[PDB]
Design a protein around this nucleic acid. Sequence first.
DNA 1: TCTCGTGCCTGGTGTCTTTAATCC
DNA 2: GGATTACACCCAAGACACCAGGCACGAGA
RNA 3: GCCUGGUGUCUUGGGU
Lengths: 511, 214, 48, 48, 49, 102
Amino acid sequence: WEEPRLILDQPAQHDNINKRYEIRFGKIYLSRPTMTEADGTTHAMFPQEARLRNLTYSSPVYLDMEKSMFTSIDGNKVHIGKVPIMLRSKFCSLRTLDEVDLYKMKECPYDMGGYFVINGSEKVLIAQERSAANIVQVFKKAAPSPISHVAEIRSALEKGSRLISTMQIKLYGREDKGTGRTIKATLPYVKQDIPIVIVFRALGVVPDGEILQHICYDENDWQMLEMLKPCIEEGFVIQDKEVALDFIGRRGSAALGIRREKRIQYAKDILQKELLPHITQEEGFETRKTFFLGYMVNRLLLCALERKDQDDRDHFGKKRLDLAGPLLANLFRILFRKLTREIYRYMQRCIETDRDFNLNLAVKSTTITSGLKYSLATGNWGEQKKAMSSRAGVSQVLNRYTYSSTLSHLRRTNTPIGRDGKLAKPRQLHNTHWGLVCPAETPEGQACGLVKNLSLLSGISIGSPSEPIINFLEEWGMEPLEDYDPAQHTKSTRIFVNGVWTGIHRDPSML
Amino acid sequence: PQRLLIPTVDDPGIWGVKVRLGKEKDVVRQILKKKLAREGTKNPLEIYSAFQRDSFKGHVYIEARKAEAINDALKGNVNVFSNNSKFLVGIVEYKDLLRPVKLTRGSYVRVKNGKFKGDLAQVDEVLENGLEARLKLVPRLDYGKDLSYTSKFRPAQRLFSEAEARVHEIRRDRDGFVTYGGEEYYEGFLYKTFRLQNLIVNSINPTLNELSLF
Amino acid sequence: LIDTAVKTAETGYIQRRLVKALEDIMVHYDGTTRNSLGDIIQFLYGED
Amino acid sequence: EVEQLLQFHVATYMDNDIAGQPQALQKSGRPVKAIRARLKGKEGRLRG
Amino acid sequence: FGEMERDCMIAHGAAGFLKERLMEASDAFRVHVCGICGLMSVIANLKKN
Amino acid sequence: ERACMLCGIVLPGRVFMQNGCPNCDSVLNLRDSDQATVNECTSSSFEGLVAVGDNEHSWVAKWLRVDRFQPGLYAVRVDGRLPSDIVAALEQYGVYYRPRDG
DNA sequence: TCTCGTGCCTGGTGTCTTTAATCC
DNA sequence: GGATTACACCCAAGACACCAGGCACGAGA
RNA sequence: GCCUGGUGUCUUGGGU
Ligand SMILES: [Zn+2]
Ligand SMILES: [Zn+2]
């Protein structure tokens, strides 16, 4: 349902008759894993046969598709591919059976599953460590750079959870070098750094006095106010919304010659979407982005004023583990678009014949089936033609040398930093690892300190909808963002839910 | 006379445009649909013609008066490279863009398809309509030896031997003419019809082996 | 464990550059120390 | 376009690490092993 | 026989041993050169001499 | 798709059977023919696809001698030639065949 | 017996847009 | 604002072009 | 009756 409909159009002049061809994807249904012989006969596949005959233990996936035919003078269960099933999961034929019949299927009751079978070979997915999304991190920069502090964030949506874009706010000016010490930001798909005041004005809040009321919540702090002084004067001449939005569009990687009448309307998309998309993407909600932008600048200056340490990149609370679920969704997303474009490219030829396509001839199940098999068998995380630049080693042959080694291998985690880059920080055992990853178990050699192993009582969060939490916060006294003023609210606590500033509460202790 | 149709400075300009390889005909098609659909509206597509030459891979040529019309013709076309790569053609280069361009009985050609692919053959005759040509070919036969063919699993070339066919596996049709397994052999050579598009008539290089034989 | 694993390659690179810098240096029969070009590096090896 | 392409193939035949332009690729997707890459590095003709 | 083993034999001064290891005990080959142009362009039929 | 040998227009073959050639059928009568006739006057083999949108003002169209014809797809080169019997019949009609095969 | 459709084999040809320090 | 530099040797298991067009064979009318 | 050829390129996991 991420891209739920395909749409075509032709303005029939050949008595104009707009004929939109539309295909809608509906419910998903799953079947138990099935071996289909060259004969044609089918039966339930159990893993022991799959290992012996070098088969893939996988389930056929069927998808409802619906055709519709708009015409204006002015299907059913199509098979889309096979998905490998994790042994002992809910969709594996061993999950039932019960101890008596397990022995008849030649399966060992001590085998706890957690792995896949691809061409007879047992493949386990290795947890991939990444930085958290939707969090602000501040780092200091090295001496031969005009920048001294940088704030960074990678924005990723909640639904799907997938990456979108990355954004930075750099503070220029060295120590007594760099003259005007102003602040410019970096926006996705714009070639050059844009001063902060300009983007504030470009969102609909233009007079200085309101801008500073969104950032600094302490009118006495003259040190912080003095550092924002050059930013006002270097963006003074941009005195209204329209010339601000146009200043942006004249840099954003587009074509040459889209004129002011539209170059604004192209930049309004780069501001509404791609810039902080985790907050919201519907229209008429620019108050949330303006308030959030002020928070970032506030955090940037606290570190530059030496009132707060720079963030520790190795703090485990700022980290996430991608396991089997999230990793497959990202791969399935890429392959399903590839299947989609092959359907679209096939309709433009098969409708010029004006012949009703039999649907089953427009879904090649080899795209998903070969895609998932290849990536799980080699560990190359991407399209086969792009094997470099893609991440390697996500899937590995399950070590079965001894029983202890099987348990460790299924609980391994990997940080994909490299072998390039010496130093020590990602390799060290950080204090916040206590009780979450083992302090002892780590490989010798090149991977030392980068590959880690989950402590015995660790667990991984499956994920939970944020919507019930919002309802609970407003029922117990949280006040909206339109009601908030630093002069009136000089002491209340800010409330974050998955990194988006959603409200303020004046009595946090009871809450 | 064709010489009175040469282009002049009063004629529209022609621009070339880079397109995805193999998609040149599709782009020409798409341009025609856009032109015809917009005829008589307030925003007509102001191109006159567009075309694509096989000899010129990856290019479409478009006839118009203003460059903006070229951009208009290609807008949204998924087969066109987004880089602002169009180029102007000189009037003195126009007719060469539209240049349209053998085979005689008794001459040699090389076969392009089937078990005889790559083999030298004499042109014996052509069909009345003008499509397929009867070729005289050194056969590649087995005399039904393992019956109960491809170009990778074919037989060596050797003249048809009717007494070998008589012995091993045949219809006499005339002096020196036999039909054997529904093919015709005259004085040891296969006579078989091939599409003219299935033979090569140009730049043939006889091999060492062919010089020894013919 | 990290230090031993990291800094072993640091010193391994050091030894490689040192060997290539010095490999052609030989004591000749007149007591001088010379490279392959016959440049004098020391007029008498080790000064003794 | 055709002369520049002859220049291209003769260039990446000798050196397929030309800075600032995409590498020549095999149909398998991996880069072509040019003569320059045959000689450099730990496994090439000289060090290996 | 890597680069570091090469250096050890130099230090021992065992020049004769190092030559043999890298030739007779491996991939020794005979080539013909032209005394004038110095290239390996000689066409040598040994039975016709 | 086939190309008319007389005018060079490119159409699905069945069109030549259904409606005849839109430029030529007053003399060629392909509409009322058999498939053998259609295949003698139209070719499955042609090269150089030309979108002609404005026949009467296109220089490209004038060069290809399709400037008096209808907008459509045309071929620069059409392989084959009209059968001598059809050429003779066209000439009886005051039509001069200029082959489009090069 | 002829025509049409499907499958297999052979030949030719790419492209939606998406790790860090040093020295010269 | 560009690349080049980044220990040594050794073991073993685990993998491999795609799409389009043309021709031939089989089945149905 | 002497001669007698079985792959490569990677990736991953390991040993000192
Ligand atoms: Zn010489
Ligand atoms: Zn015609």
